[PDB]
Structure 1
Amino acid sequence: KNTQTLMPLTERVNVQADSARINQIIDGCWVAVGTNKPHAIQRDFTNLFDGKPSYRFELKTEDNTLEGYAKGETKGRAEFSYCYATSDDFRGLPADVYQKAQITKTVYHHGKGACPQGSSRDYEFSVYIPSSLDSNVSTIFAQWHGMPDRTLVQTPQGEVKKLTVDEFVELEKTTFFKKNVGHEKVARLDKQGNPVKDKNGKPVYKAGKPNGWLVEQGGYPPLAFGFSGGLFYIKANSDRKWLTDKDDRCNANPGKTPVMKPLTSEYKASTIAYKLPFADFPKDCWITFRVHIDWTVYGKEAETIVKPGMLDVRMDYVSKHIVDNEKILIGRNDEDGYYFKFGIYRVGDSTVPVCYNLAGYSER
């Protein structure tokens, strides 16, 4: 009933498919993604950081709104993305550039907030973990995410090739994509033999059988900071395959994979760079992470590792050098780069409630 200390921020931008409208942008630099329940993300006027409102993220137990990897598994999301495009990013261009970017899901590739392939960048942000946070949460609170372009496809005959935007736009007319997998696009039909339309007159389609096409979509985040199994962990992922293979689920478990011993497949590596028992992670105070990433350089279609990456992390609240300039494989073999998000990404088929605050982001 006191609604003065917290301000719901409920606008959500589909950053891959839609430009952010000015009145959806937060503090001139963020848009929000994930569930839009009023408590999911709020500006917090009580817990100030550097004398300014911080951001309170909350997922209650019922707040998983996304399908997880396995049938019957779900996941939850309330995050800020530092990467999005606005209408100004398409200013003066032919109308079809934006329209085709929505269909190819490459809208945010036209916007600010990404770091290119093989680049080096410094990041800083702060987190505030309440003492009430359950030690068995399974949540990623900051991540650096790839930006694959789904115009890189595999044909039914197994050829990996780059479609032009126009070619992809044509393919999407006949193909219903379920994540990365193409299916025959089938019109649902009424009884007079006509295509069904929703209440707004929009034609409705469903997926038929797989049609052989695959597109580059999804993939693990190259870097994630989170809690799992009673540990705070930092996990780095690398994928050197030109077209990522979604079936190759090379993914280290902080509870099972020893620290700094990469788990590898033929193309992927997943490394737990740091672990700290949950009780040793400070509570009810602001912790500032300083992160330096030298992104791995990959050889594109050659699939080589041209140059290894490196990861450095400091944790201040005292300064602990928790990841000390580690040579590491980190990134994705894509044409495009990486963007930062923070918030709640509740994974591992968990519904344990999550709530904490974040603030103070910068990158250089």
Structure 2
Amino acid sequence: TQTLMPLTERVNVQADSARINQIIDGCWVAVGTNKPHAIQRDFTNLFDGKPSYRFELKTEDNTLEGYAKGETKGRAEFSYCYATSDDFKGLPADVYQKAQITKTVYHHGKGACPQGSSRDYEFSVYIPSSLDSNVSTIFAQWAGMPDRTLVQTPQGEVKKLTVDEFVELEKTTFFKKNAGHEKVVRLDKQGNPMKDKNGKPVYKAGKLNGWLVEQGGYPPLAFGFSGGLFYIKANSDRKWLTDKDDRCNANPGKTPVMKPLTSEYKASTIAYKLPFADFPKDCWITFRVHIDWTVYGKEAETIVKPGMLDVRMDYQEQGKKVSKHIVNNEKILIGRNDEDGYYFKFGIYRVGDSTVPVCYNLAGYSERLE
């Protein structure tokens, strides 16, 4: 009988549409390392009558680089936002091709909410007693959607390029995350141009050429464990073009609850914290999250209207129903000053250059209006 079933298909949501065989349970796509044990359907642990999702990253499963040199991180998550082939059906072939280049493929897919909207989210997590108290992982996060056609020229001027102008720039610039490098033709030992799986030319990253594109950035909301604490962290970035060098980020252990750490353009708030030992183990915990996203002033870079965060934590204890109003309708700055909105993800995002093993289950996602 089936116990655990590995779900190994992975999708690059920013640069590729998901194929039908990669979609999980009709509403998810997986991102991160493809190890069989990374993500598995779990028939031994049902949530609401359906097999749950078991996530696991062993000590050597980090495959990503952090912002600081040498630092690493790991990822095995599900994204509720992705585009499918049906999303591009009927359109000229170049729409999808340009979307791959601008890495905005998922802008054509379902799963994201608009800027400044009000939404309800719900999901459940199961933390086994085997989880080490000192893990450094985010198990649920709401990510932003920056459009890289917003760039900074070598001079330092911020400019919103058209898709075609960005395509033009991309022809001479190789982007490593948000930083532009001279696009160098990659040759083999015999100085011959290298191709890939589809016979498409391959390139290399030369020296920095001064260009920067909007990319990355802290997730506006994250649920996780760090420094022996369960915490909920909200982030706000009002700058039109995000500055990745501004590392304004609240420390769960050192930052007081609901007292935002701020820089000129960012605010990072620890909305709630709890000792890891007090987080219920070996049972399903359901979080009901309501978010009123902060409204930003675009080019003006102003906070037009503050946001709002509300969180309820429900679980069974002593056979009794428990519901903790852990974040009580708190006015807060939450979101990013972008044209597009946000999407949900859950699973494992091991950060802080940690390699402590992580394993837990997630299930029952739902979102609605309010």
Q: Same fold (TM over 0.5)?
A: yes
How many Å apart are 1:158 and its aligned residue?
2.0
Q: Among 326, 337, 340, which residue is 2:341 paired with?
A: 337
How many Å apart are 1:338 and its aligned residue?
0.1
Deviation string for 1:24-51 (max 9, x for gaps)? 1011100000000000000000100011
- Taking structure 1 as reference, are residues 199 and 77 closer, same or farther at Cα in structure 2, changes over 3 Å only? closer
SS at match of 1:99: helix
Hey, what's the Cα distance between the residues in 2 that align with 1:79 and 1:144?
12
Hey, what's the Cα distance between the residues in 1 that align with 2:161 and 2:184?
23
Hey, what's the Cα distance between the residues in 1 that align with 2:283 and 2:91?
47
How do 1:47-86 and structure 2 match up within 5 A? 47-86=45-84
Q: Percent identity of the aligned residues?
A: 98
Hey, what's the Cα distance between the residues in 2 that align with 1:332 and 1:278?
29
Hey, what's the Cα distance between the residues in 2 that align with 1:312 and 1:268?
21
- Taking structure 1 as reference, are residues 278 and 12 closer, same or farther at Cα in structure 2, changes over 3 Å only? same
Q: Among 276, 283, 286, which residue is 1:285 paired with?
A: 283
Deviation string for 1:245-298 (max 9, x for gaps)? 011010011011111110000000000000000010000000000000000000
SS at match of 1:109: helix
How many Å apart are 1:190 and its aligned residue?
4.6
How many Å apart are 1:207 and its aligned residue?
1.3
Deviation string for 1:225-262 (max 9, x for gaps)? 00000000000000000000011010011011111110
Hey, what's the Cα distance between the residues in 1 that align with 2:257 and 2:92?
51
How many Å apart are 1:109 and its aligned residue?
0.6
How many Å apart are 1:196 and its aligned residue?
4.0
When normalised by structure 1's length, the TM-score is 0.97
- Taking structure 1 as reference, are residues 193 and 127 closer, same or farther at Cα in structure 2, changes over 3 Å only? closer
How many Å apart are 1:201 and its aligned residue?
5.0
- Taking structure 1 as reference, are residues 199 and 363 closer, same or farther at Cα in structure 2, changes over 3 Å only? closer
Which stretch has the larger CA shift, 183-192 or 336-345?
A: 183-192
- Taking structure 1 as reference, are residues 199 and 163 closer, same or farther at Cα in structure 2, changes over 3 Å only? closer
How many Å apart are 1:120 and its aligned residue?
0.4
- Taking structure 1 as reference, are residues 196 and 331 closer, same or farther at Cα in structure 2, changes over 3 Å only? same
SS at match of 1:213: strand
Which stretch has the larger CA shift, 27-36 or 207-216?
A: 207-216
Q: Which runs of 5+ in 1 are unaligned?
A: none
**Could you say which residue in structure 2 is the equivalent of 1:175?**
173
How many Å apart are 1:303 and its aligned residue?
0.4
How many Å apart are 1:160 and its aligned residue?
1.1
How many Å apart are 1:203 and its aligned residue?
3.2
When normalised by structure 2's length, the TM-score is 0.96
How many Å apart are 1:195 and its aligned residue?
3.1
Deviation string for 1:293-332 (max 9, x for gaps)? 0000000000000000000000000100000000000000
How many Å apart are 1:82 and its aligned residue?
0.3
- Taking structure 1 as reference, are residues 299 and 258 closer, same or farther at Cα in structure 2, changes over 3 Å only? same
SS at match of 1:118: coil
Which stretch has the larger CA shift, 163-172 or 223-232?
A: 163-172
SS at match of 2:264: coil
Hey, what's the Cα distance between the residues in 1 that align with 2:166 and 2:272?
41
How many Å apart are 1:204 and its aligned residue?
3.1
Hey, what's the Cα distance between the residues in 1 that align with 2:37 and 2:193?
39
Residues paired across the two proteins, number: 362
Which stretch has the larger CA shift, 3-12 or 323-332?
A: 3-12
SS at match of 1:336: coil
Hey, what's the Cα distance between the residues in 1 that align with 2:257 and 2:333?
14
- Taking structure 1 as reference, are residues 34 and 192 closer, same or farther at Cα in structure 2, changes over 3 Å only? closer
SS at match of 2:18: coil
Hey, what's the Cα distance between the residues in 2 that align with 1:106 and 1:141?
25
- Taking structure 1 as reference, are residues 11 and 199 closer, same or farther at Cα in structure 2, changes over 3 Å only? closer
How many Å apart are 1:209 and its aligned residue?
1.4
- Taking structure 1 as reference, are residues 187 and 122 closer, same or farther at Cα in structure 2, changes over 3 Å only? same
SS at match of 1:45: strand
Which stretch has the larger CA shift, 39-48 or 184-193?
A: 184-193
- Segments of 4+ in structure 1 off by > 2 A? 188-204
Which stretch has the larger CA shift, 148-157 or 29-38?
A: 148-157
- Taking structure 1 as reference, are residues 65 and 175 closer, same or farther at Cα in structure 2, changes over 3 Å only? same
- Taking structure 1 as reference, are residues 191 and 283 closer, same or farther at Cα in structure 2, changes over 3 Å only? closer
How many Å apart are 1:208 and its aligned residue?
1.4
How many Å apart are 1:205 and its aligned residue?
1.9
SS at match of 1:13: coil
Hey, what's the Cα distance between the residues in 2 that align with 1:334 and 1:140?
23
SS at match of 1:207: strand
How many Å apart are 1:72 and its aligned residue?
1.6
Hey, what's the Cα distance between the residues in 2 that align with 1:200 and 1:236?
42
How many Å apart are 1:157 and its aligned residue?
2.2
How many Å apart are 1:61 and its aligned residue?
0.4
Hey, what's the Cα distance between the residues in 1 that align with 2:191 and 2:326?
64
Hey, what's the Cα distance between the residues in 2 that align with 1:188 and 1:301?
38
SS at match of 2:171: helix
Q: Which runs of 5+ in 2 are unaligned?
A: 316-321
**Could you say which residue in structure 1 is the equivalent of 2:200?**
202
Deviation string for 1:109-131 (max 9, x for gaps)? 11100010000000000000000
Deviation string for 1:124-183 (max 9, x for gaps)? 000000000000000000000000010111111222111111111111111000110111
Hey, what's the Cα distance between the residues in 2 that align with 1:349 and 1:89?
37
How many Å apart are 1:188 and its aligned residue?
2.6
How many Å apart are 1:198 and its aligned residue?
5.7
Hey, what's the Cα distance between the residues in 1 that align with 2:103 and 2:159?
17
Deviation string for 1:326-356 (max 9, x for gaps)? 0000000000000000000000000000000
